[PDB]
Amino acid sequence: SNADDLQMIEMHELIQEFYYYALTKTVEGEQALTYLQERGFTDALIKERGIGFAPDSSHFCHDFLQKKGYDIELAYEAGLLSRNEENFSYYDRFRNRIMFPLKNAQGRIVGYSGRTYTGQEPKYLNSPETPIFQKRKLLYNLDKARKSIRKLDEIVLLEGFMDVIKSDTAGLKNVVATMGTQLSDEHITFIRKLTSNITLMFDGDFAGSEATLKTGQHLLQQGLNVFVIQLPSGMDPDEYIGKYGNDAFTTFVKNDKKSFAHYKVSILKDEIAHNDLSYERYLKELSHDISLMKSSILQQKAINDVAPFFNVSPEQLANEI
């Protein structure tokens, strides 16, 4: 019910204050605080994002919510507590982790991502699916980024929320990320209402490229104008900012922004040049991709940009389309 949903949000917003105190003030939180600071998190940024620490006792969140009079079973349903399937006992889901609040589109805390700082597995532990936290709907940072997304008429999608935090701080405000999932149809529906322009900046490795191709193809199919920023090899935005600084980052992002078709064919370049079967198949694919582009202006430019990869004239490619 809406009443239960509200209680679950309250639980999240109240424990956040306790997590923040645990991280910033307590003895047990000291190592986690040092880890964040060495990773560039200022006290200001920690406070701004409301980042905290879940102690390792396994009953810190439990005892708090109990003391405040919350129903323990509801706290379990809210994804803050785990349940022993033997004695039906409850205990903290989040233990010895740095706690990053996950806010919904209206800016309410509806979940957490808990990162290890001692190399434990999994590296990041998220809230489970709950009535208020749904990964197919939530986009990290969307409530903060909405204003800039609208004014800049563009949304930038990154691979993870940590890259979002760093990018935002560096001056790139119109950024979001899913919580480790593939971009959903629901996400795309939300995004369309804000802008028709989406730029993908995933990590500069194979997995990143593959996800760029898969996500981009889907967005293109859905009628969005898709662009791609290609990071240096083995780098994510956080690593780029750490190495080159903020000004270098915001300049880089504004530099080589390529329409999806152009990015795609550049990836396939060698296979096309060497494998005639792939040449034919990818010429048909790229023709189809270009045909999906709603922007008459960008469509004509992509034809010009893609044609040389097949050693054909722009006119020949236009005819194939």
Ligand SMILES: Nc1nc2c(ncn2[C@@H]2O[C@H](COP(=O)(O)OP(=O)(O)O)[C@@H](OP(=O)(O)OP(=O)(O)O)[C@H]2O)c(=O)[nH]1
């Ligand atoms: N041990 C461990 N590592 C994890 C886990 N989740 C993600 N990683 C690794 O860390 C990178 C993704 O995490 P980030 O989002 O960069 O997190 P970070 O900044 O806090 O390190 C990856 O490098 P990558 O090799 O480039 O990933 P991929 O692109 O090759 O798949 C990925 O394999 C986990 O649960 N356990």
Ligand SMILES: [Mn+2]
């Ligand atoms: Mn990666």
Ligand SMILES: [Mn+2]
């Ligand atoms: Mn990283």
